[PDB]
Write a protein that binds this ligand. Structure first.
Ligand SMILES: Nc1nc2c(ncn2[C@@H]2O[C@H](COP(=O)(O)OP(=O)(O)O)[C@@H](O)[C@H]2O)c(=O)[nH]1
Ligand SMILES: [Mg+2]
Length: 172
């Protein structure tokens, strides 16, 4: 089938919303799941089921910061027999700190010097997926930041091409 669950993993300020907003703009048949606008994680799940029932692809724009957080979405993939691909945004804590410092307001409340302190607290819990330890993810792309702060349609195409060159970890 044409559809997938795309799990974004990355720190606050790493660029998850930038990528996901451009993706749904650029490519037919994609919906963005986001809790800071959606309401609750159950509401995210509810919307995800509705979209998968329509055979849509979904991009999970959440930090997806450890194995237990990712399991929600991997279980959903298994139930629907829909593959789970993952993009890990490889911005460092210092890069994200600098970006957060530049926010004046934000739906997450991770803003400015307050936001920097939040990020520091978060680092205790951030456990991105490893190629070895198998969670049921099909492929993992580790995506370097672009020099530019915006995401183009061309970047979206580059990303999907890079993802296609990633080895299959768990076969459908
Ligand atoms: N230089 C650079 N900036 C990015 C990139 N991706 C996002 N940004 C910038 O980093 C900031 C945080 O991005 P955001 O999408 O809000 O991060 P999120 O918290 O992970 O949703 C934004 O100002 C973006 O323009 C990237 O690949 N490279
Ligand atoms: Mg965001």
């Amino acid at each position: 089938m044409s559809n997938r669950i795309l799990l974004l993993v990355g720190l606050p300020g790493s660029g998850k919303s930038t990528l996901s907003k451009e993706l749904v703009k650029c490519k037919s048949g994609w919906e963005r799941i986001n809790q800071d606008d959606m309401g609750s994680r159950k509401a995210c799940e509810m919307h995800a089921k509705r979209f998968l029932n329509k055979k849509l692809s979904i991009v999970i724009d959440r930090c997806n910061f450890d194995e237990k957080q990712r399991k929600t979405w991997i279980d959903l993939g298994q139930k629907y027999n829909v593959p789970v691909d993952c993009i890990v945004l490889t911005a460092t804590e210092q890069e994200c700190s600098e970006r957060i410092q530049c926010r004046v307001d934000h739906p997450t409340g991770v803003i400015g010097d307050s936001g920097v302190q939040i990020l520091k607290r978060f680092m205790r819990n951030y456990r991105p997926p490893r190629i070895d330890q198998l969670e049921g993810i099909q492929r993992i792309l580790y995506l370097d930041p672009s020099p530019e702060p915006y995401c183009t349609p061309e970047r979206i195409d580059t990303i999907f091409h890079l993802l296609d060159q990633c080895p299959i970890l768990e076969q459908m």
